């Protein structure tokens, strides 16, 4: 019953913090929290490659795509591990979260501990935006806040 | 060949980027960087158990010692897989960091990803301070900044 948490920051406003919880070593994980300071609306909510924020959130990488796939959504099949879908605020810029998720992990192949999770400024394409960078990035847009993803008690 | 790395922030002026790398599973780990805005001198420089920024520096909890053994130095035989010793801070409060270690590691059993590095406020007395605080925590003081350990590119 591993447990992880992370703490969402960047040079804007947007900042949360979020919680994830697996019971069981091929079970699910369940990630909950709240992101505050966004824009009402849908906004990409995804597992980069890095758990490095030298520079910004720009640092954390490519989406978590541990066998290498086009870019889709958290329901989809061809999917990148990472990308868990969108996070909806409120019209006070704020979002509740609440998945639950069973490609992540919180250890084996698909372990997202010492990455980087990212909430971005548009809504994720889920890979029909019918363009490039939909297949390649959802069209999130830009990274508004993130932080490393650890081991939490 | 793994690579890891950690953004220092606190809540005063402390910080700085510290990298790590394993280049064979078994061997030592490397580890290097500067942490800027320290009091010149000594500082204490560990692991802790928990990459959970939460509640700032304190909740990354206690030293990261799977094996309990009693506070020691980064050189001594027992010490804690977590007490990488001190990082010196030059008259500008400027410290440059290099150092070897061999005890933690960047995966197996000491794998310290996901986990939070913290530089202290007082000097690390490598539990040969005299006392019953030595050997539990070198007598390291207040923790100045920290940051989770995220896998790097």
């Given at each position: 019953a591993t447990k992880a948490v992370?703490?969402?920051?960047?040079?804007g406003p947007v900042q949360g913090i979020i919680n994830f919880e697996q019971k069981?070593?091929?079970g699910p994980v369940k990630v909950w929290g709240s992101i505050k300071g966004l824009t009402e609306g849908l906004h990409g909510f995804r597992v980069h490659e890095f758990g490095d924020n030298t520079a910004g959130c720009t640092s954390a990488g490519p989406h978590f795509n541990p066998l290498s796939r086009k870019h889709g959504g958290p329901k989809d099949e061809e999917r990148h591990v990472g990308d868990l879908g969108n996070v909806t605020a409120?019209?006070?810029g704020?979002?509740?979260?609440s998945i639950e998720d069973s490609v992540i992990s919180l250890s084996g192949d698909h372990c997202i501990i010492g990455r980087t999770l990212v909430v971005?400024?548009?809504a994720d394409d889920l890979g029909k935006g019918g363009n490039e960078e939909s297949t390649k990035t959802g069209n999130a847009g830009?990274?508004?806040a993130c932080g490393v993803i650890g081991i939490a008690q």
């Open positions: 992370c703490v969402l920051k960047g040079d069981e070593s091929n409120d019209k006070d704020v979002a509740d979260v971005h400024e548009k830009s990274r508004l």
